């Protein structure tokens, strides 16, 4: 005797020793990315090509 068995219920595992089908379908995907930047450019100039007389000493 295997005990009471439901008639219309779907066949499910209920006790120790019962079998069950596992459909292994795994799809995992993780990603991450980052960046940082900094820039600085500086140019400066001053030139006196021709200096008038009253400015010579300066």
């Amino acid at each position: 005797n295997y005990g009471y068995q439901p008639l219309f219920e779907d066949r499910r595992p209920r006790n120790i020793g019962d079998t069950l089908t596992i459909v292994l379908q795994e799809n995992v995907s993780a990603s991450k990315s980052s960046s940082a930047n900094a820039s600085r450019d500086g140019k400066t100039s001053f030139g006196f090509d021709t200096v008038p007389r009253y400015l010579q000493g300066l």
Partner: protein, 58 residues
């Protein structure tokens, strides 16, 4: 600032790239007739079977 007392220039770099992976697969296709050698307490059947084929040189 004379005599290049404050003139300076530096550079630096650091790089790293690691990666890895693995994969496995297996396929099997055929048909084999086995025999029941045990009936369990819930009615499930233990089955064992063997097919031996010799073709020419093995």
């Amino acid at each position: 600032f004379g005599n290049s007392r404050a003139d300076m220039e530096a550079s630096g770099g650091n790089s790293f790239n690691g990666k890895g992976g693995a994969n496995a697969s297996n396929t099997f296709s055929g048909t084999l007739t086995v025999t029941v050698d045990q009936v369990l307490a819930n009615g499930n059947l233990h089955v064992v079977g063997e097919k031996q084929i010799a073709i020419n040189q093995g």
